[PDB]
Amino acid sequence: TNLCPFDEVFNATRFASVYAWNRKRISNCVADYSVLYNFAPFFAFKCYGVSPTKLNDLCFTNVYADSFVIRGNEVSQIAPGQTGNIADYNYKLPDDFTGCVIAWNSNKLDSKVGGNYNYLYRLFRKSNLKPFERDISTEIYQAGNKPCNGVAGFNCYFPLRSYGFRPTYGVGHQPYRVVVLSFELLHAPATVCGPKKS
Amino acid sequence: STIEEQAKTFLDKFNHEAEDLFYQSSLASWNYNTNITEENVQNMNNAGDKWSAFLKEQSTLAQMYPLQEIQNLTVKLQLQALQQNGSSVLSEDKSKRLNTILNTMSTIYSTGKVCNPDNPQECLLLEPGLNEIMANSLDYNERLWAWESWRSEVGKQLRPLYEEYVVLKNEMARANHYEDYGDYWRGDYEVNGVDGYDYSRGQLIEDVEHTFEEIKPLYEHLHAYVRAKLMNAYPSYISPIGCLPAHLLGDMWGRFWTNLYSLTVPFGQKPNIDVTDAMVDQAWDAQRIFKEAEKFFVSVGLPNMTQGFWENSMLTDPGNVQKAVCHPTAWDLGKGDFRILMCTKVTMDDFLTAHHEMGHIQYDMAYAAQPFLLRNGANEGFHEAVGEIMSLSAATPKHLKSIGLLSPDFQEDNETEINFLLKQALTIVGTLPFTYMLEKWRWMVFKGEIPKDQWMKKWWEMKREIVGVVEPVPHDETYCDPASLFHVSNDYSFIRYYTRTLYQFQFQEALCQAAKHEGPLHKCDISNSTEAGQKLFNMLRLGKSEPWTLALENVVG
Ligand SMILES: *[C@@H]1O[C@H](CO)[C@@H](O[C@@H]2O[C@H](CO)[C@@H](O)[C@H](O)[C@H]2NC(C)=O)[C@H](O)[C@H]1NC(C)=O
Ligand SMILES: *[C@@H]1O[C@H](CO)[C@@H](O[C@@H]2O[C@H](CO)[C@@H](O)[C@H](O)[C@H]2NC(C)=O)[C@H](O)[C@H]1NC(C)=O
Ligand SMILES: *[C@@H]1O[C@H](CO)[C@@H](O[C@@H]2O[C@H](CO)[C@@H](O)[C@H](O)[C@H]2NC(C)=O)[C@H](O)[C@H]1NC(C)=O
Ligand SMILES: *[C@@H]1O[C@H](CO)[C@@H](O[C@@H]2O[C@H](CO)[C@@H](O)[C@H](O)[C@H]2NC(C)=O)[C@H](O)[C@H]1NC(C)=O
Ligand SMILES: *[C@@H]1O[C@H](CO)[C@@H](O[C@@H]2O[C@H](CO)[C@@H](O)[C@H](O)[C@H]2NC(C)=O)[C@H](O)[C@H]1NC(C)=O
Ligand SMILES: *[C@@H]1O[C@H](CO)[C@@H](O[C@@H]2O[C@H](CO)[C@@H](O)[C@H](O)[C@H]2NC(C)=O)[C@H](O)[C@H]1NC(C)=O
Ligand SMILES: *[C@@H]1O[C@H](CO)[C@@H](O)[C@H](O)[C@H]1NC(C)=O
Ligand SMILES: [Zn+2]
Fold first, then answer.
1. In B4-120, which ranges are E strands?
2. Rounded to whole angstroms, how far apart are CA atoms B16 and B338?
3. What is the domain range of residue A194?
4. What is the nearest CA distance from B33 to chain A, expressed in angstroms?
5. N or C: which end of chain A has fewer CB within 10 A?
6. Overall number of domains in chain A
7. Ligand of minimum distance to the alpha carbon of B32
8. Distance separating alpha carbons of residues B157 and B105, to the nearest angstrom
């Protein structure tokens, strides 16, 4: 039986930024949640819709795995009903969320002496994001009332900045890999879900 | 989007970029300080110049948001900290001349030499060798020689430079609407627009002079006692109703009287508490000291160390060849990087310096959630006071005998208590008249109330009157005796040592009552009491967010 390819979205040697987060849809297969739950300390593992224990008797049409990397003290923003530079301009979760979230520390992986400027995030935007909206535009954010014609300068700034990750940071300023699962049941009669013992 | 939201958007970008650049510069400076090489010098200088340039650029960019229509006091605080021109209001010629005289004065002070009158090939510097004579010697003639020659051979070189330094600094200050350099300096205690906690820049003088008036009855009795005890070490040289000659005081200036303890000890046959051998006999190392300090800080309800503190800190002297500046400091590199740099031995004084420095580290950990510009003490005297109360509390016999460094019984006596209190008063009290008088002279000189042909006259008049010490040799207007002190020729304000000394004790008295102390105050130990930890943490976490008069109220009342 074709198992769920959770071994890739969790072992991805290179993760995606938060302003451009990765999203993988898992098709009709058998879902093994017992490969990750027994796996590791998992500094963050919060489940809202279903209880974390009974993932092996309920089924859903398709599941999405969204993957990115954020700072340590921003993991609290990945939750329905949160505000902040991440929950407003980079990644939003609807209040009726049915999936869950998990995050862990990756200081020994995504941090290098001298600065790892390959991880970006957006801190300027005209309006808030909508649930599960993804924005990759690189237009120069205009703060004042005068147009700035696509150049940086006074009252017009570049909208994206970088996490200068380094190994000599404190827990909370270190890189954390976040994977959020999202369930769905529109109308499908027989879908992907967990295995039974025979 | 009127003018205020633009300021907020500007401050966000400033915070991010400045945080990154500051981390880089601080990491470079740490790397240099813990491992002295040649490459490290320029490696740190590059980041330093980059940071300074970024700061100047942002400062000039920040002038475009006027201060008048900003309503948020936090945003106004940050913008006002970032908008201050400082120097660079002068011309280019004038600014370069100012930097030249600053460096000249510093280099004169650092490498000045005096030598024997009977063997002119024996010149001594100040640091290793003149203020060793002044600290240890008991020869009236040798002390007089050192005291006179330092001021006569090096002090006279700084007079024409100081006269120019005054003028240039006054111009730089008046070009920022300040009336003089003294007012520019006093501008650190000023508060505006809080309606209950305001504080003017000219009120500081009044508070200082009104608090000093209540210390004179104690300083007079200490002065009389020290004079009576010095009349036995230098008979026929002190008069039993006059001042004290200025060269017999314990160091080159008389800033602390702490070196007159051997002459003026009350009960010389009772050695005071010194748990040093009890530490080596129990096999104490540099890590046990800091573990005990951390346990003490957790006892009152404050957090642990950051667990990066144990890996990146240099708690011991690097052995083979890793030359480092062995000067104990607390580093706040940013982004959650707190470290301690000290070459600890196994003694009692290092056992106290550990607590003093971890106090700084705890203050830094407290306000790490504030915007970058608002990470500092409420004013210039809060940080060292918070540092000092920890060493105050951790050196009491009640704490030492609970750690295990004293015998479990150790009956104390009042004679040892008097010994201890006098050793403390020779340092804490003996330096308040000196500090007050020096900063008063400098204020009056910057203001113009002393014409430049009466500098030394007024200096020694105020020394005879306020401090109570007299010069052994007359000094005309070719000298500059103030400029022969580090803080005067290296351009540092001196009132932060007067106010801190006060705040410190206030804090202690407010923390002794929360812990329900009973006996005298000098026997307090705030350990094992979480209410004191809470009263302290309510002020530690503010930084400069609130005016200092409010933060002080959150502890003292
Ligand atoms: C994630 O990837 C790592 C590395 O590719 C996997 O580590 C492997 O572990 C197995 C069993 O312990 C070893 O036989 C391999 O040699 C390891 N790989 C390497 C490159 O040394 C790890 O198992 C992966 N995680 C999961 C859940 O599959
Ligand atoms: C102290 O600094 C010096 C000079 O920067 C370091 O010396 C060299 O550092 C390079 C850096 O990679 C090494 O590759 C060399 O092997 C070092 N040579 C020697 C003779 O030390 C030195 O390593 C630094 N000390 C510490 C403890 O980091
Ligand atoms: C402008 O002032 C308001 C209050 O005068 C600040 O509002 C505070 O915001 C912080 C976080 O942004 C909260 O923790 C506080 O609880 C808020 N206070 C109140 C009374 O609501 C606001 O932060 C200020 N602007 C900026 C940019 O800091
Ligand atoms: C800081 O210094 C500048 C000159 O270097 C002062 O002059 C103002 O500078 C701004 C910015 O270019 C101009 O818009 C004004 O027209 C200048 N003149 C004024 C305001 O009279 C500036 O005032 C100084 N700022 C402070 C706070 O002292
Ligand atoms: C330390 O305490 C002792 C005991 O209370 C003091 O000794 C007494 O002092 C009073 C005051 O002069 C005398 O009347 C008693 O006669 C003393 N007792 C004896 C047994 O002689 C001592 O004076 C105190 N010393 C200090 C410096 O406080
Ligand atoms: C702070 O309180 C703790 C807990 O009571 C004290 O530790 C105990 O002290 C008693 C008295 O000597 C000992 O009998 C116990 O063995 C200690 N237990 C532990 C776990 O240490 C501690 O001595 C107190 N510290 C101060 C300075 O009062
Ligand atoms: C501090 O660390 C020690 C381990 O050394 C642990 O036992 C204790 O619970 C910690 N306390 C806090 C407040 O972190
Ligand atoms: Zn200190």
1. 114-115
2. 19
3. 1-114+167-198
4. 17
5. C
6. 2
7. 2
8. 9
